[PDB]
Nucleic acid binder design. Sequence first.
RNA 1: AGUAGUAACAAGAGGG
RNA 2: UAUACCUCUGCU
Lengths: 49, 730, 750
Amino acid sequence: IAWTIVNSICNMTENSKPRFLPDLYDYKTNKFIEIGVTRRKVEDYYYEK
Amino acid sequence: SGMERIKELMEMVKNSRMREILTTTSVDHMAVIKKYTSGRQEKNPALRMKWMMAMKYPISASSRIREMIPEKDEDGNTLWTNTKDAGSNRVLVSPNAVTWWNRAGPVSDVVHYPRVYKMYFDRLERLTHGTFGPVKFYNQVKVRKRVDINPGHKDLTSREAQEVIMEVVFPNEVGARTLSSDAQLTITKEKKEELKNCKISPIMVAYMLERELVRRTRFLPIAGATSSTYVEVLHLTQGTCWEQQYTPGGEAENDDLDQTLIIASRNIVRRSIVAIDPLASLLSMCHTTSISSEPLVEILRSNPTDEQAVNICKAALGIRINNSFSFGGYNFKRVKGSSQRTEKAVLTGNLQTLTMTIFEGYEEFNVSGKRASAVLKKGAQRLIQAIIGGRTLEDILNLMITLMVFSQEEKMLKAVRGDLNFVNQRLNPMYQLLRHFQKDSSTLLKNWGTEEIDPIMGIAGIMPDGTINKTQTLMGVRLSQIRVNIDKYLRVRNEKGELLISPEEVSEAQGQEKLPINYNSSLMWEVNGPESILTNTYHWIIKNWELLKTQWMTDPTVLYNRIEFEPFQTLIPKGNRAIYSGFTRTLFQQMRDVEGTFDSIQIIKLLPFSAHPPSLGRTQFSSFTLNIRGAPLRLLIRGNSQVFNYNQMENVIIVLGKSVGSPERSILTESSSIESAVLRGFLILGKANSKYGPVLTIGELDKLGRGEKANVLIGQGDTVLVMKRKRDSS
Amino acid sequence: MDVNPMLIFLKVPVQNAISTTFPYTGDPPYSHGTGTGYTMDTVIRTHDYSSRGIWKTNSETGAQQLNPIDGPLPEDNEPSGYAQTDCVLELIEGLDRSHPGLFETACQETIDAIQQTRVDKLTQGRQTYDWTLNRNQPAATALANTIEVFRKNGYKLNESGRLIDFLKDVLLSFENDSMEVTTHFQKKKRIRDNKKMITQRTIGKKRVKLTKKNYLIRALTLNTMTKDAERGKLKRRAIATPGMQIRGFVYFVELLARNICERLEQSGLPVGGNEKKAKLANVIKKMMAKSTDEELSYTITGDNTKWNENQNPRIFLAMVLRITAGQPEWFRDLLAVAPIMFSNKVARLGRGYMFESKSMHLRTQISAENLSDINLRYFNEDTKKKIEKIRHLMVEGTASLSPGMMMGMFNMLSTVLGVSVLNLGQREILKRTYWWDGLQSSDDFALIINGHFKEDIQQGVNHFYRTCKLVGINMSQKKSYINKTGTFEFTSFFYRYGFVANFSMELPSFGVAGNNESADMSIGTTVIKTNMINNDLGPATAQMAIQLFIKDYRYTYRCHRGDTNLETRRTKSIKRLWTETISKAGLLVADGGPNPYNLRNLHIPEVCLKWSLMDPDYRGRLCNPNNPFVHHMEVESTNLAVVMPGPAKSLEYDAVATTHSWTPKRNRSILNTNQRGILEDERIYQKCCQVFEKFFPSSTYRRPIGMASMLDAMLSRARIDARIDLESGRISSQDFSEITNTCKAIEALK
RNA sequence: AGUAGUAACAAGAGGG
RNA sequence: UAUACCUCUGCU
Ligand SMILES: [Zn+2]
């Protein structure tokens, strides 16, 4: 069901499809979001993903 | 809109039964409850249909049939009833309802259905545009082989084809995976465009694509052409005793045409060698032969296949041999040897398995490119020697790197570090290793290895670092600053007079043709292949037996040298032909000299082996070997075998399972205890009598003196008494 | 002159006129009544072949289980099942030596299957014994019933969807000592009608708990019945049907044995007819090439007598464990389940018997369960004696059957035992004057023995024969025979220096298949086509087979040509179609059109063949996608029929979906029985699946995967599709609110 | 009676 | 008990 929600968006608005599962998607900017918050500060998990 | 679907779901959820099933049963569990049924699979559908077609209302149909067609037609036939079909909301219906629909029902647009059912309509397109030749009658030998049954398949895996189908008909419900290959993307664009705005069940479109795209095979008995479009029409083109010549519509693929051209040329060269004037015979066959109805000579003028037999045919007609190619921007030109192909997977230094079309055998190239040239000597995964020269050291070294990769050594494969990925047209795997080593070759040269050489004036070595050394060099590398002619016996040579191509060194691997070959030649038999040669040759001897038997008695040297035995000789090993002829002729003259002993079957059996200049050797033979479709078969000298079987019950000689004709009924009542024409300089007398000593093998027969009798293991578990005759035969 | 057809054999060889010995144009034998007489025979015969073995009462079932293996070595040629564990393992090891990495790969391929295989896979299959109802039901129905009763009790690991979890639930369900089941029963109510009160039969359901034995017996029970329509045999025999518990374990064990047999040249299974013949041709080629000119060659045309009755479940446990050596213990113990259940299997004894009183003129039915508590004055002498022997094995209405097997239980692993005996005959193992090779599929085998002299063959036969006896395989001395290599027989293929045709084998397939008008036309023409290719059906006879098929098809479906003077229910409506149609040649045969088929046509479907010649309106009606006659099934079951030759494989056919692709009416006898309610369950299940497909079109092609609800999935799709329809497409703002309020309303009703 | 052939059919179940 | 009817089923 998660990928059906992703693909339904990309069909009408001709955009890229990600490899792994996103968590959110903004309809104004047309950008996917991938959450990954943790006990580390910022740079150790930002540049890894 | 999607308004009525959610409205009905609300109406279903209002029902307390349906809301329970919809909530309790999961998506994975829905596949089980979908197939939940009282209905058995019918054991005897043929009986039930005959039972049910006598009934008024045997067909079940959707309840909405009551709103579409009338209850009664113009002749008062009841078309539908209100009786629900056991276990559904469908209603029981007359066959007259189906007829009423087909004559007076709602019309719909179905003009693009031939694109949905393309696999089916392609069969009619090939048949409609097909061309029939004549029907020849003969014993059709059929090899049981795995072959394609789905012509025009765009070759993908089941999972790859599943992704393509999903993209075309269910675009919104494609999973995590995406279209990987450029084949998958281009097929999807074509399918999306062809099938757009076509009112038909998506279930049926998914089904027809699954059948069309994916390759399917079956074990079938095939005579002749094995390619998909000929396999499609086996029922039409072959029977037990006939071949209906037929070319399907559309053009043959180059793969099938190159494979069958090689087989045609090989068969033409193998035939010509054993004739008196090979080049005239080869030329005679080349102008008469056709492949897929296209003449062989215009194929040889346009087709660039590089193969020893094809090149002998090209050389005999004065056509340029495709002697050259390019790789890394250098023109390779073969001056000696030959290329033999073998696709295999090998591990690199990064443990990456990759399928390489590796070349084998000893070859020699004169290589030349931009500002540098070389003389390469190569073997199977071996750089034997490379003498390189050029305007600059970099130009020499750049050519050197190209040759080292072109050699396909295990040195250079193991010296690769990392994964190989280049481009969005992706190149073949030879260029993946080249472009890797063109960028960085630090490990290549370290792992290649050095060798010591003698200081020759003009030659110098190239070290791993890049220095020029005089007495040291990389393994094989040295640095230093085409018409053809073909003789009567098909030997291809150069201006200097050195051997380029030999008929003896043509590959003996037959293989079954992909497209039909017709040699319209008196030098060849009616049907292609080696089983045909056996059957037609033995059929011919029986048919003309009365003429050839008296010709056997009076003047045997003209019988032995008959041109009809020449095809048979291709099946005998080259080396064996002479000694086999020596053995056969000695055995035949024994039958003439030892009066009384005459066996018509034994003459007929061995007669084709005579057709060669005989050797003076004294070896014994319990069988003659015959090469039939790769495997060796052994025709036994005494009695029946797979290759030759005289059946007394039928009064028929069976050659490889097929009756070859009845010999005269005289030969049933034709025998004598003494059997000549089995062992050279000996005579089989009768049963094994133990008075004359213990059993000797056929190799041990040299011990026995002149006129001495002994027991021998002759063949097929029989032990037999044999005497050495005193005076030997001509 | 007295005519005698068999005198043709004086001139024509037997193999060349073998069709004259196949009487396959007549109706084959059928059993009338029950197969209780045969099931008892099989059970009694099976135990007699193992009689010198060891009896032990089972801890769990209390059933009397005969163990013949590692027992006294046989002292006669009678059928024996005294297999020796050590001798079986030597042969299976000998197979491992000869094919290094075969057992490794076969196991690894089976492990990959076990991880990926869903519970769905058990819906695909023939009739299965339902322990829930003590009767046979379709595979999917028996699965759903077994899952439902499992879910009502404490067993929901299969919730995940993977099959191995369902298999755990089956092993965990033996621990329950109060397994609840809902049996159905009839009640006689009365209701008023305007002004007389009429009796009303209704069906209620009663919850019954089972004993720990009761459930255990039922899970190990395999149903029995007589095999009908079987050729070449005077007497009927019993066939068996596995239960839902053992089924899933059997799937994976046969899947291993399949992967083993797939890479064994000596196995006839699982390949088709032509490939079977190619395999026999290869071994003859291989035996002649390896031999010398001094040597002999004989071929046994081979039948194994009492094949299933003498193959033992304990021996299959030895094979499965040896084949899986060095693999993870979870995988070894999973595949070991099916042999264990087969070793502790019990057999249902069928319907029972019917009695008859001539003077009183009455008949009556006693159940097979009554065979314990019943007087023997009723039965005849042979039947009595069998009941007396069966009582010693009887356990809760079902006879125990530890040793042996029965037809329909188990498939390919038995061939691997036979193949290991064939593999023993390599020259490098035997190292003596004789040696052998061959092919085998089940009881049928073709053994080729080479040696230096005729007595070497006799020693080789005896060595093969006795080695087969050491693993409970009994070669028939009466049905098998031997001759010099050149002719033989194998599964009714006849070799005479090459395979000859056996057309008469295929005569039952020439006729109207009885699926529907569309499918049968495609099936009929393809049968003619394939027989021209595979069984030497000549061109003139093939033309006549088209001519006779059209006749049979025209009469069966009452769809004679539109210009005929016949009178049926269909002639008038077809006549109206005939007259209005401009291009008559375009009409299908089912619509009173002409036969387009000759030899060259047979591979082209009829609609496809007539397309260009059709009237546009007729073509538009014929292939109308919104027509009420077609049942829009899944892609996996599109253009499939069922056919018997083996067990019963599916037949795929090439056909364009039209109004002629209809389905005949269902059987309605369930309406009178206590299982009447199953029809409404089915009606409700289909309506739920029909609505799901409107939200998930893909479900008809590829089966969907999720542990979430059907409703919650449909709800999720209703919101997101309506989002995209408004955010970029053709839908109003008021419609988006109307859909999302309905989704809120549906969520409010749980 | 007749079908049939190792056991059945020669209607079964219900309106009780 | 009988004789008329009526309903369901024809692979379940
Ligand atoms: Zn007719």
